[PDB]
Amino acid sequence: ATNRDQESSGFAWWAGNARLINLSGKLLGAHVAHAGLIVFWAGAMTLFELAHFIPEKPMYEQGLILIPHIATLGWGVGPGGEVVDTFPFFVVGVVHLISSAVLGFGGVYHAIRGPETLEEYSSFFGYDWKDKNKMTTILGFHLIVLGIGALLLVAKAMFFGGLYDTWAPGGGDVRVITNPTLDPRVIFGYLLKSPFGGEGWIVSVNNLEDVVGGHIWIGLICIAGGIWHILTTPFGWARRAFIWSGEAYLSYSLGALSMMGFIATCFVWFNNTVYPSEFYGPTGPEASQAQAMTFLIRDQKLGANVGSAQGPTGLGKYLMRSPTGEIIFGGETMRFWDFRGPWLEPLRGPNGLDLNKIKNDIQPWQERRAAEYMTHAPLGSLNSVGGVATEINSVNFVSPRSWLATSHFVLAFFFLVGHLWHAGRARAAAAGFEKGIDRESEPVLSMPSLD
Amino acid sequence: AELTPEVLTVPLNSEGKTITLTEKQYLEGKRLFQYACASCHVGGITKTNPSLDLRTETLALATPPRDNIEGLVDYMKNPTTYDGEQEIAEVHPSLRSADIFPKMRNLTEKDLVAIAGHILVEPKILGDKWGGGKVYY
Amino acid sequence: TTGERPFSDIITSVRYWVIHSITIPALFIAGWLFVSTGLAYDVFGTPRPDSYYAQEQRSIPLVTDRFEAKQQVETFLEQLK
Amino acid sequence: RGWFDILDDWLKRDRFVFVGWSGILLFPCAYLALGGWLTGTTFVTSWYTHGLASSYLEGCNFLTVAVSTPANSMGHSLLLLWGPEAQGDFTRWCQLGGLWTFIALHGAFGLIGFMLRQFEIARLVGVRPYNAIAFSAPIAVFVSVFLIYPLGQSSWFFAPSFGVAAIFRFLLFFQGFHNWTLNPFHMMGVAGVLGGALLCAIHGATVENTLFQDGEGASTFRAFNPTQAEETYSMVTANRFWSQIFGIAFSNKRWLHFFMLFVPVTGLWMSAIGVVGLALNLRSYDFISQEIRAAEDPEFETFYTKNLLLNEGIRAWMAPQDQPHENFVFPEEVLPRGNAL
Amino acid sequence: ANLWERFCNWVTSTDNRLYVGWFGVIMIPTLLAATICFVIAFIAAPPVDIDGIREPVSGSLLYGNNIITGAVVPSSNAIGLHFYPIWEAASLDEWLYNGGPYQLIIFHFLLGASCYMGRQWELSYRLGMRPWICVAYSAPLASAFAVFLIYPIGQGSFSDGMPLGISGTFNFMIVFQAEHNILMHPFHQLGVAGVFGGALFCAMHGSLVTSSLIRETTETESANYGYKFGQEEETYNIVAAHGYFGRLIFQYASFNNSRSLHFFLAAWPVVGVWFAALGISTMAFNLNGFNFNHSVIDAKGNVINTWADIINRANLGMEVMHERNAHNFPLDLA
Amino acid sequence: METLKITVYIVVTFFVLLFVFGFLSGDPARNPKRKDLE
Ligand code: CLA
Ligand code: CLA
Ligand code: CLA
Ligand code: CLA
Ligand code: CLA
Ligand code: CLA
Ligand SMILES: CC1=C(/C=C/C(C)=C/C=C/C(C)=C/C=C/C=C(C)/C=C/C=C(C)/C=C/C2=C(C)CCCC2(C)C)C(C)(C)CCC1
Ligand SMILES: CC1=C(/C=C/C(C)=C/C=C/C(C)=C/C=C/C=C(C)/C=C/C=C(C)/C=C/C2=C(C)CCCC2(C)C)C(C)(C)CCC1
Ligand SMILES: CC1=C(/C=C/C(C)=C/C=C/C(C)=C/C=C/C=C(C)/C=C/C=C(C)/C=C/C2=C(C)CCCC2(C)C)C(C)(C)CCC1
Ligand SMILES: CCCCCCCCCCCCO[C@@H]1O[C@H](CO)[C@@H](O[C@H]2O[C@H](CO)[C@@H](O)[C@H](O)[C@H]2O)[C@H](O)[C@H]1O
Ligand SMILES: [Ca+2]
Ligand SMILES: [Cl-]
Ligand SMILES: [Cl-]
Ligand SMILES: [Cl-]
Ligand SMILES: [Fe+2]
């Protein structure tokens, strides 16, 4: 039983997977088996959601987070996001579940049956962490894989049904993307936008052309980069800047994933394009705005002139100006005026909310949508009582946007912590004092006193 | 205190006829009300227009009267403004607008009766809490 | 060590489990019945779900007199007919 | 070697659970306080004292169960089982809130017992009794909050009830009625608790990251012997690190650990003084200059006046259900409310 | 050696009275800026329209505040999450009316404290230390992020970030309880276990070590003089300390390993406070405390209050009173 | 304001460049023990 106790390995049971660091075959096993865990949960969770799914209820009233993901890709839904066929959901679930058996098979094999090290078995599959060449090559393979995935999204969007477009003229619908955005000014333009209000960095992407073109770009970039990393070895400055070891690489990727986690938190909280509100429920901004719209409509039906109604503070009760002058909804929702949504935009003119349009053009479907979104705001308790904390039990509801945002903030945080942990440790180990200070060679003792 | 047959006896129509709901009907009513109505009417108020509540006195002063089973069933089919003057199916869930309010599609006549009964019985249990809003929490 | 037998020994011994595979379920079942028979309600004076209010009452039976509190609670209970 | 000394012998035997003379006070009182809390929270109502359900039996969960205080009309009655109120009736006694006084009193004597235990064992083992001394802060807190505070008020009713959500209520009540967060004694308390937590964190982390390599293992816990003479971490390296990071650093270990005793213990004692003040409604509620200005000048606003508006909300909206003996009826129109809400 | 090389050697020098380092290169100017702006504002800033309703709140000393009431007031609701640096204002007077100082200070400070964490890593590396003191620091830091950045992001406005002042902090806490019922949230409860527990364990460790100090002094001098800085011998008898504690509870509830013990001392409050931070950071997206309002019901259907319903009543008072002129519609949705 | 903005932009860029180029300047080697970390 090689390296399977503290004595031989140096690592206690609670740090047991650290015993796998230079056992490439067993480590392969752990990784493939974990991949199987992920795929398993995708499929199983999908089937669970689908069994618990009433088609004539909004997805977001049913605690669904995967079916919304499938629906956004254009599978299973029609105009307005209405479920017209559940079978594709069933397929996604079943095929992931079946695939997880394969992955778990391979993982269990490599983990407790196959060659514990791969280097003496195969020079192609074996590796040394310090071998910068081989490392960048494996990196390369996987970059090619990622690029291929992004291109799979492109292909779905352009050649296999299209995507669900909440912005589709005449109402949200599945639409084929025929003219993806290729212009780099736009695509990387997103990357150079401020993350602050009214800008929102890449989180602000608000049309499917930009999304598809974005993935075209990312796919080519990843494939080219992957080939590049197969055919080269790290340059000198890179060599002198980095720590070259398993734990170090793990730390780098942990930092990356933490970043990605935070980014996704913001994505699901603000964006309503790749997270359609039809499937995920309204964003917080969306719902607040929707309340303002709702009572503007009610009060205006009662005979109120909403453009001239002065609120208690002196600001418009219904309508006011943004700091740069655009007409916007009044009340606290003044903070959310950067919100844009398919149900509100028909009321918007060059200077913002248009009073004539507001007086004459508001349609019943808009009232409906505003009411729905206002009454499904992403607020709710941990035991899933919907509404503000003071609400009485009755409505079983917490928005999928809340579940997704909170989960992924928690995970991004702990992954940042993990990055600090393993980065610091990788530095200490590479320099050689990760187990403590050498009593006979205590560095501080050879330093001049501070005073 | 118990949920008695007397508590569960509510006006069927405007002409003094009553109907006694079973306990199964009461539970069905609460479930269906939560299913199709509570998002706006939790606790007997109305979130998208708090001026109108689901208190029995309020429903009685509505036009046509809505403080009985037939009134509430009709409302769930062809809802009107408080004065009866406008049909508001286009902005309020009903069987008539099941196409644009899809949770209404699987509601049967039986279901409408259960919901109606819930709306009428619950104030008999909760008193001023029903339609009271946060003051009465 | 302080002279008692190690717990590791005891709980992994056969005799321990011969004893406790009887004594633990017995206790559990006893507590269960203490609830299911309704004895708990009567011992501790706790309201059953139908004994918080009389049918048309909506006033909490709050104790308001220190020295005749017992008689108060008793009257409150009689008020449930 | 007479009976007293034979008894002493037996009480002080080196067994799995040390007994001692102090164990005679401690174990029955601690057991009765624990058991009383568990009995009450499992089976016992609060209907007749508060108009509340408070047990598992009634449908409460871990967060909402409590052994609640007695009715306000009981005043500060010891509420003994054989007293003039319960008159020997166990059931009535439960209904009147006897378990609250039972738990608080047995609990208090249990805390005395436990601190006595700390002295007794320290004396037997040959160490200085600084653990017991430190335990005086828990005592001060329990006695000020559960005994003195309600004794200053109308009755045991306004003591904290023994329950999670019940304690949360105690907190919110103290904000609304006492403006307790404004109180400099509470603030000293907060500084002692958060400062204590900080010291705990930073000392543990510092020791763990200035360890000497005393083994070959990457898991470094085994490279310590309890009997060893040498420091297991470098105080000199620790000192230079913190000196260059924060400007100052401990250099004396004895001072460091005394300080770790001193900060949280002092914090808790101060908080105790504040609650003793709140027993008499002797609050730090207001700043008189603030109020003179605000009263005369309707454009003057600070976070202090903001918080008082919050307090006013709390009192008006919580009092009728939180204080049922008062029979408060606050008509809708008199409830303080901002716009819309 | 060239100029840049020399400069690097200085920056990363182990011999500076205060370590600089590359994290320090960012930390020092940002912390200085945040500090200077904070002091000037706290003394002399005019009232700030925090809630964007032209209802300016006075935070500074010169404008009617003492130490307890004073604050640097959060930026205007009208601004929301917009970036509002000095050069976006038409003038310093506008900048001040709209709460610009708050954004300048909290951004410079969040950056500076982040670099403080990094710098703790850096110096540990230069001194041949183990690296994880910075991980302990990550807990208070995460909390700072939670109340100055994350909660504003989730609620859509830096106007809901925690105010830089004592009373402002209490304001934040009370409004937070109103809208998220944070007391009933298990992550806040773990945070309380974290700091109550940290306090307990601080007092306990402090008192056990103090109780087992080895006699090295006379009764007329401080016992502290019995320890000398850098002595290789431990200054207390941990066998005696463990004998005591193990007898106080029972033997196996006590630590015989100093490393294990100190690791515990680090882990408990750090993890607890991590959960406090995550609690704030997730209530940022309105996943709130447990709601057991009207959870218990009798046979007829009457509501039977629990302590949770009393809590609910208090929250209601807070809710209806907070920001009394800022809401025009019935639901406070952010 | 435009002068202030340009000024701050230049300052921030200066210090950021210092940070980056600093950490690129053989930082793993800046420790007491093993320096060959390339
Ligand atoms: C994702 C979770 C995960 C995975 C994939 C692994 C994987 C691994 N661990 Mg780690 N470990 C984990 C979590 C995980 N661990 C956790 C949470 C802890 C703390 C408890 C540890 C503590 C730990 C220690 C202390 C050690 C390991 C070791 C190992 C390796 C050898 C296992 C072995 O030889 O045991 C043999 C086990 C058995 C013979 C029992 C059966 C195990 C199989 C895999 C169960 C399969 C179940 C599955 C349903 C079957 C599906 C079949 C179907 C597909 C046909 C292996 C690569 C060891 C190592 O590094 O060796 C060099 C080692 O010493 N682990
Ligand atoms: C891809 C992500 C990843 C990978 C591959 C690793 C890999 C490793 N970590 Mg790292 N780590 C990570 C992320 C990762 N970590 C994160 C996100 C954190 C922040 C918490 C850490 C913090 C950390 C520390 C402090 C340490 C490691 C250590 C290690 C090494 C040993 C791990 C082990 O055997 O634990 C065995 C697994 C366990 C003992 C199980 C832990 C139980 C968790 C905490 C419960 C989580 C609750 C669960 C999610 C929900 C409740 C479920 C319950 C109700 C059933 C191994 C190389 C050790 C090391 O330094 O080796 C060099 C070590 O000391 N990691
Ligand atoms: C990205 C992760 C994620 C998200 C956002 C969701 C979200 C949801 N799930 Mg899903 N699910 C997940 C992963 C996730 N799940 C996993 C891993 C499983 C297997 C356990 C499931 C299995 C599952 C089932 C069977 C069901 C759901 C349901 C739901 C819905 C209700 C959630 C609820 O009430 O939680 C309750 C909240 C909790 C239980 C609190 C969890 C707190 C964790 C343990 C804290 C952990 C912190 C950290 C990880 C620990 C680190 C330690 C530190 C020291 C380092 C909601 C949409 C329900 C539904 O409505 O279906 C339609 C439902 O029935 N989920
Ligand atoms: C995913 C990562 C991965 C990696 C790097 C390896 C690597 C290895 N495996 Mg393992 N294995 C894996 C997953 C992996 N396997 C899985 C998923 C299973 C379950 C089927 C197994 C079951 C398994 C067994 C039973 C054996 C190995 C063996 C080997 C070794 C010989 C490989 C060879 O010469 O094949 C030659 C390569 C080919 C014939 C080409 C394969 C064509 C592929 C499968 C087409 C699909 C490609 C596409 C990208 C798949 C995407 C899947 C993704 C969506 C999840 C090599 C070290 C052998 C060994 O260790 O001997 C000592 C061995 O006996 N593997
Ligand atoms: C998984 C993704 C991945 C990873 C881990 C790597 C890893 C690496 N790359 Mg590779 N690369 C990739 C994808 C990846 N690459 C792709 C997709 C391409 C095609 C575009 C390339 C093209 C490429 C080239 C041409 C080179 C590398 C090189 C390298 C090596 C050193 C790079 C470095 O120092 O980064 C650290 C990054 C920097 C030092 C950049 C400047 C630092 C600033 C401050 C970053 C600020 C970013 C900011 C925080 C991001 C916010 C958003 C932003 C848009 C505003 C390292 C092994 C170098 C090498 O050694 O090749 C052999 C090299 O010359 N890569
Ligand atoms: C040492 C452990 C200990 C201590 C300090 C206490 C202390 C207390 N108990 Mg608890 N109790 C204990 C163990 C203890 N108990 C045990 C083991 C049981 C299980 C039987 C109980 C069961 C119990 C119940 C059911 C109740 C208490 C109550 C009390 C409180 C009132 C007691 C009182 O007035 O006594 C008065 C008696 C003395 C102080 C004895 C002193 C006698 C002197 C020294 C000798 C003279 C005696 C004389 C010769 C007798 C002549 C009699 C003649 C006149 C007829 C007090 C806080 C009451 C309470 O908490 O109400 C809220 C209550 O209802 N206890
Ligand atoms: C290594 C290791 C580990 C781990 C392991 C793992 C992680 C594994 C995994 C595994 C896996 C990952 C597995 C999987 C499996 C799967 C399966 C086996 C499946 C099957 C399926 C089916 C059979 C289906 C069915 C169906 C259909 C078809 C239709 C619908 C319905 C149903 C569902 C019925 C541990 C930690 C223990 C430790 C030791 C070492
Ligand atoms: C898909 C899509 C898109 C696109 C995207 C893109 C195009 C992206 C890109 C991206 C990118 C392009 C990214 C990048 C990143 C980078 C990073 C993240 C970096 C990092 C770095 C580092 C970390 C470094 C560090 C350091 C320093 C600084 C100093 C020296 C040392 C060292 C090296 C350590 C859009 C939006 C259009 C739309 C949607 C869809
Ligand atoms: C009061 C009184 C008394 C006393 C009695 C007693 C002494 C009792 C005891 C009692 C007891 C002694 C009871 C107990 C109970 C217990 C229980 C009921 C438990 C439960 C548990 C659980 C539920 C667990 C949980 C958990 C945790 C804690 C953590 C880990 C995880 C888990 C979740 C598992 C006398 C007669 C003298 C007189 C009259 C008055
Ligand atoms: C704003 C984004 C900026 C992105 C910049 C990306 C640049 C990528 C290539 C970086 C080139 C690195 O070039 C780096 O700088 C100078 C060059 O004289 C060297 O300078 C350093 O060398 C040694 C290395 O031990 C140091 O001890 C010494 O203090 C210093 O002179 C670094 O060793 C070299 O690695
Ligand atoms: Ca290569
Ligand atoms: Cl009314
Ligand atoms: Cl306020
Ligand atoms: Cl509003
Ligand atoms: Fe210590």
Ordered by start, the domain boundaries in chain E are 1-334
Contact call for F37 and A432, based on CB within 8 A: no
Best residue among A37, A403, A411 to mutate for probing ligand 3, ranked by most atoms within 8 Å of CB: A403
Interatomic CA distance for residues A170 and A77, integer angstroms: 16
Is the distance from CB of A272 to CB of A283 less than 8 angstroms? yes
Q: Do residues A81 and A207 share a domain?
A: yes
What are the backbone dihedrals phi and psi of residue E301, each rounded to the nearest 5 degrees, phi first? 115, 0
Q: How many domains, in total, are found in chain B?
A: 1
DSSP state of A396: B
Q: What is the dihedral sign for C-alpha E276, E279, E280, E281? A: positive
Interatomic CA distance for residues A283 and A352, integer angstroms: 20
Chain F residues near residue E87 by CB distance under 8 angstroms: 1-2, 4-5, 8
Q: What is the dihedral sign for C-alpha E177, E181, E183, E189? A: negative
Residue with tokens 């670099």: E115
Distances in whole angstroms, Cα of residue E56 to Cα of each of A17, D34, E76, E169, E258? 57, 52, 9, 18, 55
Q: How many domains, in total, are found in chain A?
A: 2
**Both ends of chain F: CA-CA distance in Å?**
46
Q: Whose CA is nearest to atom 5 of ligand 8?
A: A214
Largest CA distance in chain F: 50
Q: How many CB pairs under 8 A join A and F?
A: 34
* Nearest alpha carbon to residue E275 among E91, E146, E135, E87: E146
CATH number for the domain including A286? 1.10.10.670
DSSP state of E236: B
Interatomic CA distance for residues B27 and D137, integer angstroms: 54
Interatomic CA distance for residues D76 and D31, integer angstroms: 24
Is the distance from CB of A258 to CB of A172 less than 8 angstroms? no
Torsion of CA A262, A265, A269, A275, to 10 degrees: 120
* Nearest alpha carbon to residue D150 among D287, D316, D278, D301: D278
Query: What is the least distance, in Å, from the CA of F31 to any CA of chain A?
Result: 7
Q: Whose CA is nearest to atom 24 of ligand 1?
A: A16
* Nearest alpha carbon to residue E305 among C52, D336, B26: C52
Q: Using only the alpha carbons of chain A, give its radius of gyration.
A: 27
Of all ligands present, the nearest one to the C-alpha of E7 is 10
Q: Do residues A276 and A287 share a domain?
A: no
* Nearest alpha carbon to residue D164 among D294, D262, D66: D66
Interface of A with D in 5-44 (CB under 8 A): 6, 10-12, 14-15, 18
CATH number for the domain including B35? 1.10.760.10
Interatomic CA distance for residues A122 and A141, integer angstroms: 17
Of E25, E26, E128, Cβ closest to residue F32: E128
Q: How many domains, in total, are found in chain D?
A: 1
Q: Whose CA is nearest to atom 28 of ligand 5?
A: A234
Interatomic CA distance for residues E225 and E207, integer angstroms: 18
- Encoding tokens for residue A8? 């031989």
Q: Do residues A260 and A300 share a domain?
A: no
Residue D47's SS3 state is helix
Q: Please give all residues whose beta carbon lies within 6 A of any atom in ligand 9, as ranges.
A: D 31-32, 35-36, 38-39, 102
Q: Please give all residues whose beta carbon lies within 6 A of any atom in ligand 10, as ranges.
A: A 237, 240; E 4-5, 8; F 17, 20, 24-26, 29
Tell me whether chains D and A touch (3+ CB pairs under 8 A): yes
Best residue among F14, F24, F27 to mutate for probing ligand 10, ranked by most atoms within 8 Å of CB: F24
Torsion of CA D195, D196, D200, D202, to 10 degrees: 10
Is the distance from CB of A17 to CB of A422 less than 8 angstroms? no
Chain E residues near residue F11 by CB distance under 8 angstroms: 29
Q: What is the dihedral sign for C-alpha A22, A28, A29, A31? A: positive
The experimental method, as deposited, was X-ray
Chain D residues near residue A442 by CB distance under 8 angstroms: 212, 234, 236-237
Is the distance from CB of D54 to CB of C40 less than 8 angstroms? no
Q: Please give all residues whose beta carbon lies within 6 A of any atom in ligand 5, as ranges.
A: A 136, 139, 143, 191, 221-222, 224-225, 228-229, 232, 234-235, 238, 241; F 20
Burial of A235 (0-12, 13-18, 19+ CB in 10 A): exposed
Of all ligands present, the nearest one to the C-alpha of B51 is 12
Query: What is the least distance, in Å, from the CA of B16 to any CA of chain A?
Result: 32
Closest residue on chain C to B124 (Cα): C56
Q: Do residues A294 and A146 share a domain?
A: no
Q: Do residues A13 and A63 share a domain?
A: yes
Q: Which positions ≥6 away from D96 have C-beta within 8 Å? A: C63, C69, C70, C73, D48, D49, D70, D71, D74, D79, D85, D86
Residue E190's SS3 state is helix
- What domains can be seen in chain C, in order of their start residue? 1-81 (1.20.5.860)
Q: Whose CA is nearest to atom 12 of ligand 1?
A: A17
Annotated binding-site residue? A415: yes
Q: Do residues A166 and A233 share a domain?
A: yes
- Encoding tokens for residue D319? 């009092």
Contact of B46 with chain A, judged by CB distance below 8 Å, is answered with no
Task: Specify the long-range contacts of residues D26-31, CB closer than 8 Å, at least 24 apart.
Answer: D26/D110, D26/D113, D26/D114, D26/D116, D26/D117, D27/D113, D28/D106, D29/D106, D29/D107, D29/D109, D29/D110, D29/D113, D30/D106, D30/D107, D30/D110, D30/D113, D30/D114
Is the distance from CB of C55 to CB of E300 less than 8 angstroms? yes
Chain E residues near residue C58 by CB distance under 8 angstroms: 302
Q: Do residues A95 and A179 share a domain?
A: yes
Of all ligands present, the nearest one to the C-alpha of A180 is 8
Interatomic CA distance for residues A408 and A266, integer angstroms: 9
Write down which residue in A347, A377, A407 finishes a domain.
A377
Interface of B with A in 61-80 (CB under 8 A): none
Owning domain of residue A316: 282-377
Query: What is the least distance, in Å, from the CA of F12 to any CA of chain A?
Result: 16
Largest CA distance in chain E: 89
Closest residue on chain E to B27 (Cα): E301
Interatomic CA distance for residues D149 and E173, integer angstroms: 24
Q: Do residues A148 and A195 share a domain?
A: yes
DSSP state of E47: P
Interatomic CA distance for residues F32 and A184, integer angstroms: 47
Between vectors from CA D335 to CA D329 and to CA D339, what angle results, nearest 5°? 160
Of E22, E85, E86, Cβ closest to residue F23: E22
DSSP state of E297: B
**Which conformational region is residue E298 in: left (phi greater than 0), alpha (psi within -120 to 50 degrees), or beta?**
beta
Is the distance from CB of D271 to CB of D250 less than 8 angstroms? no
Interatomic CA distance for residues A406 and A389, integer angstroms: 17
Q: How far is the CA of F24 from the centre of ligand 11 (A)?
A: 22
* Nearest alpha carbon to residue A65 among A280, A292, A328, A264: A280
Of D51, D75, D324, Cβ closest to residue C66: D75
Best residue among A229, A239, A240 to mutate for probing ligand 5, ranked by most atoms within 8 Å of CB: A229
Owning domain of residue D56: 1-341
Interface test with E, best of D174, D287, D341 (most E CBs within 10 A): D341
Is the distance from CB of E77 to CB of A332 less than 8 angstroms? yes
* Nearest alpha carbon to residue D242 among E32, E123, E112, E141: E123
Annotated binding-site residue? D106: yes
